[PDB]
Amino acid sequence: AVKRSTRLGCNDCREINYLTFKNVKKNPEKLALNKFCSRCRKVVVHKEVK
Amino acid sequence: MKVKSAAKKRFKLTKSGQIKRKHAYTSHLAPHKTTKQKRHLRKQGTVSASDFKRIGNLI
Amino acid sequence: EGGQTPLYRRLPKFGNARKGFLKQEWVVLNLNKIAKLKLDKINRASLIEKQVISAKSQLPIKLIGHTKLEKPLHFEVHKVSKQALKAVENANGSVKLLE
RNA sequence: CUACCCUUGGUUGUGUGCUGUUCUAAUUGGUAACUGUUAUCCAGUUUCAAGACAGUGUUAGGUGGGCAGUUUGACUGGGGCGGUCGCCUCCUAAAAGGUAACGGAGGCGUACAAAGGUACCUUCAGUACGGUUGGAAAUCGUAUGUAGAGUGUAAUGGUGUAAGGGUGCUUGACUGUGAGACAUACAGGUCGAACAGGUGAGAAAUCAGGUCAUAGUGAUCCGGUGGUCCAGUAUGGAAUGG
RNA sequence: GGACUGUUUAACUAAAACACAACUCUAUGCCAAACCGUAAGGUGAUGUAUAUGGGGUGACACCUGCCCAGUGCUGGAAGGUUAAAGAAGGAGGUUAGCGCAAGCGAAGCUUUUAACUGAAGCCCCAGUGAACGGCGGCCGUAACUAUAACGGUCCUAAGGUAGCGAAAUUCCUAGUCGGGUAAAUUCCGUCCCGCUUGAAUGGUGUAACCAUCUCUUGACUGUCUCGGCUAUAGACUCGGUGAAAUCCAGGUACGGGUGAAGACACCCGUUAGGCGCAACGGGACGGAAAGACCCCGUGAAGCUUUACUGUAGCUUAAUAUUG
RNA sequence: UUGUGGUAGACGAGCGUUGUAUUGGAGUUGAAGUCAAAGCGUGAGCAUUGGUGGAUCCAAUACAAGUGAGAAUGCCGGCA
RNA sequence: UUCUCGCAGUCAGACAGUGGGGGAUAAGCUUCAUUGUCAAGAGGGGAAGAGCCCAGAUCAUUAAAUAAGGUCCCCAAAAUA
RNA sequence: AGGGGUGAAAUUCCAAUCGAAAUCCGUGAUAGCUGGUUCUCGUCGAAAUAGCUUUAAGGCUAGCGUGAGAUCACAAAUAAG
RNA sequence: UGUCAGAGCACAUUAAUGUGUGAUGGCGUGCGUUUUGAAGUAUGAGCCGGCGAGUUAUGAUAGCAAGCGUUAGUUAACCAGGAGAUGGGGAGCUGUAGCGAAAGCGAGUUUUAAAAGAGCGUUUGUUUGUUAUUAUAGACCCGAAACGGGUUGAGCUAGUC
RNA sequence: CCUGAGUAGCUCGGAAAACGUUAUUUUGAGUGAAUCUGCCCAGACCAUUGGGUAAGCCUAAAUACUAAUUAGUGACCGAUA
RNA sequence: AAUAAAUAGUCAAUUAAAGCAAUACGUGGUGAAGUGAAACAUCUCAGUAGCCACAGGAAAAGAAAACGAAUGUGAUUCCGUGUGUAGUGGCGAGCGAAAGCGGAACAGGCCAAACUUAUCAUUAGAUAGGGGUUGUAGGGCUUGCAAUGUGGACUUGAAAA
């Protein structure tokens, strides 16, 4: 099975928030994106976790 | 008679029947599932009328 | 099931935090039901005479039910619901919490 | 100079087993002698031989069909090797849907911060005409061409300013849901108005809860990781459990 | 073919089998190995390496070609790898106390396995094939030549050496050839590219011998040509006695068609007085034998094994014996 | 009015026998059992009579069945 | 022919027609869908025939109209051109 | 003396029988496979299809039949459009 | 292998279109069995007589009836007695509030910031009697090759002394 | 001054415990405390607290059971039982 | 005896069976298989079948270092509730408590220990006497008082029924 999806947690409240599909070859760089956080109840910068 | 120990660990009983069951497929991979499926499988349900004939006789 | 996997081993199992722990029971006094009861100046001594609770037993008492009544009485309970507490205090009844 | 922390050696010493010495003073004997006894069994003494070994008790290892208990799926115009067991696309399938075949045709055990979205701009392939190297074929200018182009891909299709290309901006590729439908024996799988909050794209109305779509995935037991407003066997914690 | 005399499945098969003297290999130094039993103990054996035990080939004569690739065994120790167990050490809890909180945190218990030590053994290196066993291709070239005497190439550890070679082995095949035979898919010797021969899981000659097999030959005969008669015991009759398998019930014909596809019972046409006896048995898909031939059963049983898991036995380390 | 094909199978209503228990009766002036004959029944059954027969039954009601025989290569026994 | 409840039963179907596929538009063959039958329901025609045709049987009739189908005889049942 | 003995070896023999004797018990082992299963009557009265299955002889669910209740015409069919 | 009839014959009864019997006419290929199915050349059954295979103990569910009936019903056990009902006996249970993993809360809970929207709640019954079914008990009757344990056989063969 | 030492216990394998090794209890092997100021236990454990001080023994009573005797009974079977 | 003593040993006297079965129960040791799980290696079966040893009128067990979390009882034993509970389990098959209560049924005592007396050579580490059978701590030592006191779990006779 191919496994290249990645979990996305938070850099402030620090829990896994989402799971996305990002290429580990054409752009394996960090993606500190903006998503909704319920524990913050606002748009927060979520960070990919290996 | 005795109550099935294995069975009773997975079904609750509510008022006026309506045996509450659990939801499976929570084991391995979220990416194999969609957001609606993940947010709906958390809710628990009750066996059907056809299933009820196989649940009432079970206990 | 004729070769099909049994239903219990196809679904997850419950988890009980009260494992190895037996929850303390609570005799609940719902206002709608105890309205049928004619007892006044309620205490554990009177309740056992009416067999609402076993005489050779004592259990903590909880108050329950927002169904308003129309008589002031004396309540000696251990637990109480907020809406039930409001219902029994507005009915001019006196309630003393026991512990 | 009053000293300390590191590299290392010499360096007196106390403890630990490792080999190399004897020794029986453990021990054994299927050495011999004597007594019970007239008893080659046995017991006792002495001697002899090793000997703190072997050996036994336990623990932990390796060889170990020598031995023991079990196993070795189904389908198949009968047995058997063949091929398959899951999922998706076309015909079969007879114009609702759907319908079998060990019938006729192919694939999947995915790809992508763009190939999602937003706002804006833009329109074929092929063919033809004319042009340096340069032609059959490099490309441009124009005409023509109904899209046979292209759509991340297997087939189905649709896709003629689109479902495709270019530019800029974010990653709604939202949180909690959800009336309601689909399909169905269960499990499940499909869509989902609309709501609360928060955003993103665009001034905008509107759109965004992934890709034009359908394959693209394994329940459950058990186990691990983080958090938890959960419990803490009398209590207090903790372990541990949820 | 086997050396032989012999043993063999009681009650199908008496041998090309097995055994067999002999040959070869291997282990065992004594309280021997081995074997049995839990263990004393016992055979071996009250033997003592010319004895016992195993493995294989099985008169006698001549040989046993190559290869240690992999395996098994033996030997070797460096190298890596290796348990239980010991503790170098680390972390955490409860809380005395210190602490404004937060937190730090002595001692007791607490919990955890990591430095290092840890054998035997495995990986590693050699020998052992009369130890398992295995022991090739491509191209050019021989008065064609497919052949293969030969020369180059590739692969392997080596590529069956000798011997034999339609054989108990040869599918083709009834191979060819000569003899045999008027005429012989059998037989005798030969031809050597031999599907899949082959040297102790042995090979060739091999004297004699086989209730051994096969072919030919002199004689020999009712085996046959070609069958028949004599006497009995039956078969037949008489007197006595007298059971069995089978058995839904029957008064139980023919041909065609039909059928669950092979009709005494069906329909159509035919014929047959009834009952017997003697032969002989077409049929009643005759009889006993709930298929046993083949298949299935999430059947059983046994057997083999790098199928799994255990485990006897053997071996190694620790610990008490044990200084 | 529909009506009265039907396996599996569903549903409903009844009958037979024994015993217990209460109310009855008969019976050496013959009970049961058995055989027979020329009855009644939708059927489980009910009779009637003749004689063997030589001392037990039947009728009405509930309760409970070692309760209802066409096969089981059915068990035994008897018989061809 | 809706739902619930109780009890089920069946998956080894076959035949005929239609449209087929495979096999050969060979097979009383297989696979299918559809229309009827037997299974689970007899009867008449069909020479006797489970699946063809007519047809769906409470029972008694020595009553009538008939369906398919038939009318020389077996064997009820017509003749004219 | 029987997961034993014996065996010039053949799976030989071990009381006319033996891939391992017989006897009693666990055990009434198990039998998706065979066989059978004993009074009357009335009414209704299918399926041999689908999915799943260490699964094709089996078993589970559906659909179906039947019985009780309700719905009782908006439901369901039959014709016409 | 008999039916529907029926000549004739001999009779005369549970007196009735009677019985027995049938020269002859029409018609007609057994019973269970399992299969899609057998007159079947598919199997079983010779016949006869008895016998011969869905019970029980407990518990639950469903139906019908009853008692009680909105904190009632009901006793397990135990005791008094005729081997008896009965009485004494409330030990406990069910229904009388559920939600949430639980803490906790509760005519609301949980998800959630939100009772937003959704889940359930927002309330009936108890115990016996009959029948049926299911569950534990071998649990309609019968049929395996099988495994272990406890024992006896070497008198038959074999082996040796 | 004393109150039951190879004792409690710790470890290696165990077993009983509903428990398939988990508090607790027992030991085949190793090891091995304190002296009521102490220990055990309050299902790991730790502190406080609670309770009792193992490491000696005995114990009618309700308890299973009839081989039988005595008297009696059987909604027991009646020679196929 | 070898060995002086000494043991081993030899003989003599006394005492318990040794043995049978109640074809029923108990304990302890030992200890299966088929089977179910649709198969099977966990497990179930089952600590059961079976064997042994000992019996007894029953056996085992029994006085809290018992439990266990309560103003909790204060030997043990048995039934029921607790409940098919919590849990345990290829967390599968399956197994399954325990407190608490209602009852059936009551019996509490006895040795070492501390210290002490006497007798053995008092290397006592030997024997016989008070002591006293514990945690609500006690016993031992000593100084005092009050008493003979019930009880049996208990000996002989006598009487009665």
GROMACS .gro file of C-alpha atoms (C1' of nucleotides) in nm, chain E residues 5-11 15 17-19 290 296-299 301-303, chain H residues 8-17 19-20 32 34-35 54-57:
model
   38
  455U      C1'    1   2.167  -7.550   0.041
  456G      C1'    2   1.789  -7.234   0.286
  457U      C1'    3   1.340  -6.809   0.523
  458U      C1'    4   0.922  -6.591   0.336
  459U      C1'    5   0.295  -6.329   0.346
  460A      C1'    6  -0.062  -6.966   0.904
  461A      C1'    7  -0.540  -6.989   0.484
  465A      C1'    8   1.041  -6.585  -0.578
  467A      C1'    9   1.282  -6.126  -0.309
  468C      C1'   10   1.511  -6.185   0.168
  469A      C1'   11   1.871  -6.436   0.415
  740A      C1'   12  -2.660  -4.988   0.258
  746C      C1'   13  -1.701  -3.561  -0.161
  747G      C1'   14  -1.719  -3.518   0.365
  748U      C1'   15  -1.395  -2.854   0.714
  749G      C1'   16  -1.439  -3.836   0.850
  751A      C1'   17  -0.661  -4.426   1.089
  752G      C1'   18  -0.154  -4.528   0.993
  753C      C1'   19   0.319  -4.384   0.741
  942A      C1'   20   1.606  -6.518   0.757
  943A      C1'   21   1.135  -5.906   0.700
  944A      C1'   22   0.618  -6.013   0.410
  945U      C1'   23   0.347  -5.420   0.716
  946U      C1'   24   0.466  -6.185   0.941
  947C      C1'   25   0.224  -6.349   1.373
  948C      C1'   26   0.026  -6.248   1.857
  949A      C1'   27  -0.613  -6.807   1.993
  950A      C1'   28  -0.952  -6.974   1.209
  951U      C1'   29  -0.967  -6.265   1.257
  953G      C1'   30  -0.095  -5.032   0.980
  954A      C1'   31  -0.155  -5.266   1.491
  966G      C1'   32  -2.338  -3.068   0.749
  968U      C1'   33  -2.825  -4.242   0.543
  969G      C1'   34  -3.253  -4.468   0.742
  988U      C1'   35  -1.267  -2.280   0.529
  989U      C1'   36  -1.835  -2.208   0.110
  990A      C1'   37  -2.121  -2.518  -0.275
  991A      C1'   38  -2.501  -3.202   0.047
   0.00000   0.00000   0.00000
